[PDB]
Amino acid sequence: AKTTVTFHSGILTIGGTVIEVAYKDAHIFFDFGTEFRPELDLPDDHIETLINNRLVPELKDLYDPRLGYEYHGAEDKDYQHTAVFLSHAHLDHSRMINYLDPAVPLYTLKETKMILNSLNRKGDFLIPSPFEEKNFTREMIGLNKNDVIKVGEISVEIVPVDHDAYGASALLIRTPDHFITYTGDLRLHGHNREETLAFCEKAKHTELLMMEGVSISFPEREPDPAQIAVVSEEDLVQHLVRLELENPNRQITFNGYPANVERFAKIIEKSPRTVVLEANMAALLLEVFGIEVRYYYAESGKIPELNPALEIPYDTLLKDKTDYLWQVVNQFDNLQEGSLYIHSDAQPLGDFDPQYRVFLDLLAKKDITFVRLACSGHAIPEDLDKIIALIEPQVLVPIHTLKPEKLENPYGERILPERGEQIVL
- Which residues contact Zn ion (rule: CB under 5 A)? 90, 92, 185
Least distance from C-beta 90 to Zn ion, angstroms? Answer: 4
Give the nearer residue to Zn ion in terms of CB position, either 13 or 255: 13
| Distance in Å, CB of 145 to Zn ion, minimum | 18
User: Using an 8 Å Cβ cutoff, are 277 and 287 in contact?
Assistant: no
DSSP letter for 119, please.
H
292 contacts 286 by C-beta, under 8 angstroms: yes
Is residue 205 marked as binding?
A: no
Contact 149, 83 (CB under 8 A): yes
Residue 292: how many CB atoms within 10 A of its CB? 14
Residue 27 known to bind ligand: no
CB nearer to Zn ion: pick between 214 and 265: 214
The answer to whether the annotation marks 46 as part of a ligand binding site is no
Element (DSSP H or E) covering residue 272:
none
Tell me the closest approach of the beta carbon of residue 400 to Zn ion, in angstroms: 6
Cα 177 to Cα 181: distance, rounded to the nearest angstrom: 14
Q: Work out the number of other CB atoms within 10 angstroms of the CB of residue 181.
A: 26
Measured on CA atoms in the order 38, 39, 44, 45, is the torsion positive or negative? negative
Nearer Cβ to Zn ion (27/90): 90
Q: How far is the CB of 334 from Zn ion (least distance, A)?
A: 32
* Cβ proximity to Zn ion, 266 vs 400, nearer residue: 400
In degrees and rounded to multiples of 5, residue 275 shows phi and psi of: -85, 140
Closer to Zn ion by CB, 17 or 206: give it.
Answer: 17
Beta-bridged to residue 9, according to DSSP, are 18
Given a contact cutoff of 8 angstroms between Cβ atoms, the answer to whether 148 and 155 are in contact is yes
- Give how far the C-alpha of residue 150 lies from the chain's centroid of Cα atoms, to the nearest Å: 25
Strand order in the sheet with 26-30: 141-143, 106-109, 81-85, 26-30, 18-23, 3-9, 422-424
Q: Centre a 10 Å sphere on the Cβ of residue 124 and count the other Cβ atoms it contains.
A: 11
Which lies closer to Zn ion via its Cβ, residue 183 or residue 327?
A: 183
CB of 391 to Zn ion, least distance (A): 19
Q: What is the nearest approach in angstroms of Zn ion to the Cβ of residue 378?
A: 7
Q: Cis peptide leading into 101, omega within 30 of 0?
A: no
Compare residues 251 and 260 and give the one whose CB is closer to Zn ion: 260
Distance of CA 141 to the CA centre of its chain: 18
Q: Which run of H or of E encompasses 114?
A: helix 110-119
81 belongs to an annotated ligand binding site: no
The reply to whether 88 sits in an annotated binding site is: yes
- In this structure, what DSSP letter does residue 65 have? G
- Cβ closer to Zn ion: 35 or 92? 92
CA proximity to 383, closest of 238, 214, 268:
214
| Closest distance to Zn ion from the beta carbon of 92 (Å) | 5
Residue 101's CB is within 10 A of a number of other CB atoms, namely: 18
Residues of the binding site for Zn(2+): 88, 90, 92-93, 163, 185, 400
Q: Which residues are annotated as a binding site?
A: 88, 90, 92-93, 163, 185, 400
